[PDB]
């Protein structure tokens, strides 16, 4: 159990991290689903003016 004295906060935080080890391998490149656009970005058309 988490055990703390009266003057310590009785609710504490954990920060979790993750990473790949060097036995990792990735294959078959594809476009990332994490970014996309519906219209021209602001200023894009001004590059033609």
């Amino acid at each position: 159990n988490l055990i703390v004295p009266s003057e310590s906060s009785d609710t504490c935080s954990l920060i979790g991290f993750i990473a790949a080890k060097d036995d990792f391998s990735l294959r078959l490149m594809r476009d990332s689903p994490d970014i996309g656009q519906s219209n021209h970005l602001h200023g894009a058309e001004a590059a033609y003016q």
Partner: protein
Amino acid sequence: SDRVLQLKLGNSAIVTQEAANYCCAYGEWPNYLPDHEAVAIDKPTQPETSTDRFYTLRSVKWESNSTGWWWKLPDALNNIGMFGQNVQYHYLYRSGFLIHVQCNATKFHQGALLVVAIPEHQRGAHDTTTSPGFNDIMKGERGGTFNHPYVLDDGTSIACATIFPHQWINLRTNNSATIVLPWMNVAPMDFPLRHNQWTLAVIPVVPLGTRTMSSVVPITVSIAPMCCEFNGLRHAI
């Protein structure tokens, strides 16, 4: 240096940053049954990682008036994981055990637990001539509690219990106890469902106390069988 420790067996690992060295019962270490000591002639199965790994039992709460707890081996694990399956499907078993008892608190808490591994701890009943019954002895994963820890529930004494392999968990000093147990028996193997080689006893000789914020202080037991071997295969009991 002798206060930090990592134990790794199979797919399990445990670390402690507040240990007190660790005990090897009678200065021995677990090992597989040699040919010159073997009796059962069938080829044994040695599961290795599926059974020689840490099994954590349900925790218990250390209270101001607690008398102590006990867990018998292999009974406590006879129904847990692949160790439990091998035990149920085989007439004979053999193994050592790596015991790790855990209990942390606060630098404002005090208390001392005797953590002792008792070989052949034959319990006695109090104030009656009737011998203890099956249900008084076989508690399984839950374990039991001491009625009269002062005499180890067997008419002897906890005072001299230090003659058995042990460590202590003195809150101001450490937060865990570790004991390595070799196979302990008069026979090379045994029937796991009717005989317990060792009994893990955790007894608060000095009660839990503090004047700071009151919190539930648990005691947790993790046990890893070592060098497991099973013979006499059949159906599950």
